[PDB]
Design a protein around this nucleic acid. Structure first.
Ligand SMILES: [Mg+2]
Ligand SMILES: [Mg+2]
Ligand SMILES: [Mg+2]
Ligand SMILES: [Mg+2]
Ligand SMILES: [Mg+2]
Ligand SMILES: [Mg+2]
Ligand SMILES: [Mg+2]
Ligand SMILES: [Mg+2]
Ligand SMILES: [Mg+2]
Ligand SMILES: [Mg+2]
Ligand SMILES: [Mg+2]
Ligand SMILES: [Mg+2]
Ligand SMILES: [Mg+2]
Ligand SMILES: [Mg+2]
Ligand SMILES: [Mg+2]
Ligand SMILES: [Mg+2]
Ligand SMILES: [Mg+2]
Ligand SMILES: [Mg+2]
Ligand SMILES: [Mg+2]
Ligand SMILES: [Mg+2]
Ligand SMILES: [Mg+2]
Ligand SMILES: [Mg+2]
Ligand SMILES: [Mg+2]
Ligand SMILES: [Mg+2]
Ligand SMILES: [Mg+2]
Ligand SMILES: [Mg+2]
Lengths: 46, 26, 124, 97, 41, 141, 217, 178, 202
RNA sequence: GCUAAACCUAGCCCCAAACCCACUCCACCUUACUACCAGACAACCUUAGCCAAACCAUUUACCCAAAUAAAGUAUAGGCGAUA
RNA sequence: GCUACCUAAGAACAGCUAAAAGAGCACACCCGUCUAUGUAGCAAAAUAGUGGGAAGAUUUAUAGGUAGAGGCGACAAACCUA
RNA sequence: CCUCCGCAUAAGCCUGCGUCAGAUAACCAACUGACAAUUAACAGCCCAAUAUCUACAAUCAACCAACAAGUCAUUAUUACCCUCACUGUCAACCCAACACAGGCAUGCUCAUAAGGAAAGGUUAAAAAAAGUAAAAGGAACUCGGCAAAUCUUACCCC
């Protein structure tokens, strides 16, 4: 009907989908961390 | 800031002319 | 959306995370048999407090004390000032060898000693 | 407004110092030094710019050919992109074709 | 930026001078007067 | 101690002992009215009620009956000129129910030259009456 | 109200701790007021201390320099020479003399001196003044001057530049002994009560009455 | 029992409290050991009292009388800890020849950023536990690119710094004749 | 503290200093000639002579010094005037306030000659520091000054929380080689029959 | 007359030369920054394509180890573009 | 983390007929037939009324899964963070 | 005068209308600075091993009655001293760019003991929106009984 409410928050789903451990388990998830520390972002993962 | 002072000199001349027109001495 | 810069904490999560996270408090016991906890007097710390009876020292020092040039302690100085007397007297009077070194004081094997030095068991 | 109200500080220009008095010296060293040296090894500068002139393409190709292995990643990347763009520009674009 | 114009004020203000007596926003603004001063000339 | 590794105890082993502790406590006046026997402390996030019990019993030699624990959240609302959030440090709190008849109460602490020259000048100064008409009160004529 | 508002707002501050000290050149107030009449050994000891701290010092020449300093300070007021006026006047005497005259000029000329200026008494300060000392002298002066005050717009508030009027005052000078660079400078005035009031102003004046907050009385 | 959380009540409401000089690490070295163990608890009690005074002062919205007293006792305890840690350092280096008093080793992480990984206390061996095996102390080839990139970045920052300080010296030597 | 900070007359942390230099302010820096601590030869309390600026050709006593800006604060010299009273209703009593002065602007003085004479930074034969005068050499001593930490080291009295000098200086150390914890244990008289068992480390 | 306007520093770019980094107080691969228990789980693969060829389908420069020159020669190529 | 579909283990469904029901009236609940308003709106798809179903092929909270040369789909070329 | 909302739990954010001072639809402040605060029994944070046992739904579970065939248990042996620690506990709060007329599972209340205020003031022009009432006629308007009103029959295509 009406949009905008796509983000129904859940900390569990968040930490599982965009988590340090998932990023470190998948190889490309290490490449994102490296690109991000190279740019200098404070939060390397979520 | 823009470099150069020839234009600043010309503008000082115009400013002092305007000042004389505004409050000319006797 | 959610905040990233704010540090993850026990407050933020659901029941499970709120219960499992912990705010840095160290362990004291274990948990078994229907959430029954068990602490132990061997894992509990025991503050060792001496009596202050007949105690002269005071937390602050008067300005009358003279300034002293700094001499940081070190191993060579310690050995030369503490053990060298025994070593040299036993040398020039009796006889010794690399053996009989525990007499002068030395732990060739650390374990078997209560207070280990590396890895050190005690704290501070 | 872009013009400035007050004048800037007057430039001090010492027309007589080390470089301005010694300027151009030892430029004919080859001509009146029994040709022991050419003036092109005199200039202090990059290794790929020493007695050599060229346009953008020539300069970038010379850079990557001579000192390209010592280049940083982003620098070599954008250099190759530059020479690619300049190749197709100089060869396809403009009048006189 | 290495080469920038400093006398734009004067080069526009001579035209503004010629255009002072005009009516409306022409006398004040520049692009509106440029279309008019050449016409007056 | 805080920020110090403990020795892992396993069955039939020695007993853990602290000699030079590092934990520091903040006796504070409460904002809410606790009973007379109660005391309130502000302490680090690492301490707990049992080690605080041993602490008070050994250091200050005071009998302690019960202890409750709380955590307070430092407000992360403040923002600098950079719009970066400033967080106040968190702190744990310890509510100590005292022994048989201690009945503690937080006591009162704060019940009770150029400056002299300044006040001398001030009490020497006299305000010009309106009859003067804004004239300086200096000249004689 | 400063401390109360500070505590209520939360602007808690520590005392200013610093080795530096605020140095001054004139003590506030006076040590001894020569209450004039309706018309001693202490001063002798004072002069002895003055001579001790500063051997090069005479008394009978003091009234001349005093009158000179007076008239030249008034000329400096006319000319607006505030730098030398400061060098010759103390920080206590500068405000009351130069505060209200802002937004307006002034005219003051010295016609003559009917009676010669005469020393009245001398006082010396105790050592407990920030580890320094200051000496005071009092001098009666009886002369004839003119005064004329034009406001912002150049119209006279009162006084006339042509007609002088006899005038009597008791001026007080003081000097810093600890430093050698200090010189005698005007400090204050006594304005005794028994003296008559000066000439009023040509303009008429009113005052606002008690403003009755909305409740009669 | 609890008055030791507060100074002498006659000092209450006083703006300036007397306080002595700080402790000297040389003095603590020269002194004994159990004397230092006792002085530790002395300084602990004093520090608790001072911090209670500070917090109550902030509560009442007033300043404290003697602020430097606090950092005095703090630096005293700091020098004490330093002296004792130096004693045990020398003792360890005499017995074994170890300086850090906690096992560690240089190891390369998956990010290629080699670091001094320290050791924890474990009951079962590393080859039998499963949690430790996942830490994956090694980097793969694709990380060398990013390592080179961060190296280039460090080079850029460093070169910028040197050029800037050279410019500073140049401009000040230009302005000043010398 | 922030970079490119301005060390004005007021000290750090003071209300005036923080209102003059808030955290967000970013003004131009100040160009000060480099001056090493070895080359520095100006200490507080020393007599100094000035020959330019306001009140040129005078001498006085240094009140303090700012080593960052190479500034000197002399009492009663180079003084402007400022009000201090509450300007809301009271006018504000006037008082003199000193100005800073540069080391190149100020000159030192000999105690005997009381004249401006340049300085050199030598080592006396007995060692190991001396400040010497120009053509006619005179050794220049340092000015005496009350340290800020202790208001008086001579007129000092031992408080209750202060320890005696004899107790502070007297040493009771014993090079026993023994561990602190163990020596504390046997000083208490306590013992523990249980031996610490081995554990892994990784 | 207001709104406004002006400034000159912070610093940065290209080169040269020179090789370069790590609290060693606690914590950080489980939901990273979380003191503490039995898993057997490990990587080694042609770059492609846009575009040019006036469409497109073979093809179409992109470094890898001395600057210049030989030489844009020998050669290759829907023997065309081009290499 | 919306959505299409699925997995694990859960929850909701008044009252009245019928008394068996992929049955009927009808709240909650789900959906969105019709009308008007609104159209930079209360809203980047809503509001009032009227409407279909509402013990089932029902609705729905929670954690997980299927990833684009693809998934999923009671095929509308639907849906896969406006 | 309303209340179809409320209370609380879960989920979610994280100090976000508590005290004190301040200037700054109306500025109680929901804005800034300091101070305090939410105290576990409630809920999370668990289970030594080996082998072994575990056909018979629920629906008041009784009868009847089935189909879509269903959410629950131990046992023998070995080892087994101690004890109650840690973590959430606030709010006018969540996702929709907003203090949004929108969306939001669960237990109780089913008209409230709880929670709220449609009208800033005046006049009562047009046009417009939402309703109420209407003489006689009662679809003649209209593409069409759209809408409103009332409770109504019969027949076709798919
Ligand atoms: Mg969005
Ligand atoms: Mg959902
Ligand atoms: Mg975000
Ligand atoms: Mg709790
Ligand atoms: Mg192809
Ligand atoms: Mg049905
Ligand atoms: Mg139905
Ligand atoms: Mg329809
Ligand atoms: Mg429809
Ligand atoms: Mg149905
Ligand atoms: Mg039913
Ligand atoms: Mg179809
Ligand atoms: Mg179609
Ligand atoms: Mg419980
Ligand atoms: Mg709650
Ligand atoms: Mg919904
Ligand atoms: Mg109510
Ligand atoms: Mg209203
Ligand atoms: Mg309205
Ligand atoms: Mg209205
Ligand atoms: Mg009708
Ligand atoms: Mg009909
Ligand atoms: Mg019709
Ligand atoms: Mg019809
Ligand atoms: Mg029709
Ligand atoms: Mg209808």
């Amino acid at each position: 009907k009406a949009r905008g409410n796509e983000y129904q928050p859940s900390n569990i789903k968040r930490k599982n989908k965009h988590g340090w451990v998932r990023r470190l388990s998948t190889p490309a998830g290490v490449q994102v961390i490296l690109r991000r520390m190279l740019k200098g972002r404070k939060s390397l993962s979520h | 800031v823009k470099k150069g002072f020839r234009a600043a000199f010309r503008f000082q001349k115009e400013l002092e002319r305007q000042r004389l027109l505004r409050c000319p001495p006797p | 959306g959610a905040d990233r810069m704010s540090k993850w904490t026990s407050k933020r999560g659901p029941r499970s995370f709120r219960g499992r996270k912990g705010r840095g408090a160290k362990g004291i016991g274990f948990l078994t048999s229907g959430w029954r906890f068990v602490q132990i007097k061997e894992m509990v710390p025991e503050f060792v407090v001496p009596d202050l009876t007949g105690f002269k020292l005071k937390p602050y020092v008067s300005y009358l004390a003279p300034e002293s040039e700094e001499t940081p302690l070190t191993a060579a100085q310690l050995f030369s000032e503490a053990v060298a007397p025994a070593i040299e007297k036993d040398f020039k009077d009796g006889t010794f060898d690399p053996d009989n070194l525990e007499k002068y004081g030395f732990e060739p094997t650390q374990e078997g000693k209560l207070f280990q030095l590396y890895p050190r068991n005690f704290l501070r | 407004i872009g013009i400035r109200l007050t004048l800037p500080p007057p430039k001090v220009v010492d027309r007589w110092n080390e470089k301005r008095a010694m300027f151009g010296v030892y430029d004919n060293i080859g001509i009146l030094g029994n040709f022991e040296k050419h003036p092109k090894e005199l200039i202090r500068g990059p290794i790929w710019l020493r007695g050599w002139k060229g346009n953008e393409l020539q300069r970038c190709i010379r850079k990557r050919k001579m000192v390209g292995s010592r280049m940083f990643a982003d620098d070599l990347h954008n250099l190759n992109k530059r020479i690619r763009y300049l190749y197709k520009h100089f060869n396809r674009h403009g009048k006189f074709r | 930026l290495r080469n920038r114009v400093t006398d734009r004020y004067f080069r526009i203000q001579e035209v503004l001078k010629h255009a002072r007596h005009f009516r409306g926003r022409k006398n004040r603004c520049y692009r509106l007067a440029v279309r008019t001063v050449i016409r007056a000339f | 101690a805080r920020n110090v590794v403990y020795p892992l105890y396993r069955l039939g082993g020695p007993q853990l002992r602290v000699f030079r502790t590092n934990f520091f406590i903040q006796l504070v006046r409460p904002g809410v009215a606790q009973p007379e026997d109660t005391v309130q402390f502000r302490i680090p996030m690492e301490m707990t009620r049992v080690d605080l019990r041993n602490y008070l019993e050994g250091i200050y030699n005071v009998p302690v009956a019960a202890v409750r624990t709380r955590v307070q959240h430092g407000s992360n609302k403040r923002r600098d000129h950079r719009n970066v959030r400033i967080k106040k440090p968190d702190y744990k709190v310890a509510y100590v129910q005292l022994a048989h008849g201690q009945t503690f109460t937080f006591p009162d602490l704060f019940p009770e030259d150029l400056y002299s020259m300044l006040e001398e000048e001030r009490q020497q100064r006299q305000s010009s009456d309106p009859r003067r008409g804004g004239v300086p009160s200096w000249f004689g004529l | 109200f400063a401390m109360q508002h500070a505590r209520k707002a939360g602007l808690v501050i520590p005392p200013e701790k610093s080795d530096r000290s605020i140095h001054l050149a004139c003590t506030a107030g006076i040590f001894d007021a020569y209450v004039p009449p309706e018309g001693t050994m202490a001063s002798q000891v004072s002069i002895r201390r003055i001579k001790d701290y500063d051997a090069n010092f005479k008394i009978k020449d003091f009234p001349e320099k005093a009158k000179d300093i007076f008239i030249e300070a008034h000329l400096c007021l006319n000319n607006s020479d505030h730098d030398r006026l400061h060098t010759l006047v103390t920080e206590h005497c500068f405000p009351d003399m130069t505060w209200d005259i802002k937004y307006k000029t002034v005219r003051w000329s010295f016609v003559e001196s009917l009676e010669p200026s005469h020393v009245v008494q001398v006082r010396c300060s105790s050592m407990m003044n920030q580890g320094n000392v200051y000496g005071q002298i009092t001098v009666r002066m009886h002369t004839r001057q003119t005064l004329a005050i034009y406001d912002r717009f150049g119209r006279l508030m009162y006084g006339q530049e042509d007609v002088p009027k006899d005038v009597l005052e008791y001026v007080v000078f003081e000097k810093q002994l600890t430093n050698p660079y200090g010189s005698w400078r005007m400090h204050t005035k006594i304005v005794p009560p028994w003296a008559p009031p000066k000439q009023p102003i040509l303009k008429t004046v009113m005052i606002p009455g008690p403003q009755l907050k909305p409740e009669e009385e | 029992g609890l008055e030791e959380f507060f100074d002498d009540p006659k000092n209450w409401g006083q703006e300036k409290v007397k306080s002595g000089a700080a402790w000297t690490c040389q003095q603590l070295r020269n002194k004994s050991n159990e004397d230092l163990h006792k002085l530790w608890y002395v300084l602990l009690k004093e520090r608790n009292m001072l911090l209670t005074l500070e917090q109550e002062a902030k509560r009442q919205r007033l300043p404290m009388p003697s602020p430097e007293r606090l950092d005095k006792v703090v630096d005293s305890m700091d020098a004490l800890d330093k002296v004792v840690q130096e004693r045990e350092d020398a003792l360890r280096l005499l017995q074994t020849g170890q300086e850090r008093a906690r096992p560690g080793a240089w190891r390369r992480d998956i990010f290629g950023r080699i670091i001094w990984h320290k050791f924890k206390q474990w009951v079962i061996p590393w080859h039998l536990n499963k949690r430790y095996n996942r830490k994956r102390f090694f980097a793969l080839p694709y990380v060398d690119h990013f390592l080179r990139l961060e190296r280039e970045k460090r080079a850029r920052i460093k070169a910028r710094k040197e050029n800037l300080e050279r410019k500073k010296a140049k401009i000040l030597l230009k302005k000043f004749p010398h | 503290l922030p970079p490119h900070y301005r060390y004005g007359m007021s000290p750090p942390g003071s209300v005036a200093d923080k209102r003059k230099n808030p955290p967000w302010i970013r003004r131009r820096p100040v160009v000060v000639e480099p001056i090493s601590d070895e080359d520095w030869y100006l200490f507080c309390g020393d007599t100094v002579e000035i020959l330019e600026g306001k009140d040129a050709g005078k001498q006085g006593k240094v009140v303090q010094v700012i080593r960052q800006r190479n500034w000197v604060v002399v009492g009663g010299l180079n003084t402007h005037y400022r009000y201090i009273g509450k300007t809301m209703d009271y006018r504000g009593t006037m008082i003199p306030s000193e100005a800073p002065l540069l080391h190149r602007q100020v000159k030192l003085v000999d105690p005997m000659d009381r004249k401006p004479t340049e300085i050199e930074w030598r080592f006396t034969e007995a060692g190991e520091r001396v400040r010497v005068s120009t053509r006619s050499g005179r050794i220049i001593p340092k000015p005496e000054f009350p340290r800020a930490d202790g208001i008086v080291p001579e007129t000092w009295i031992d408080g209750p929380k202060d320890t005696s000098v004899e107790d502070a200086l007297e040493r009771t150390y014993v090079p026993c080689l023994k561990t602190l914890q163990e020596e504390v244990m046997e000083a208490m008289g306590i013992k523990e029959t249980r031996k610490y068992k081995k554990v892994y480390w990784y």
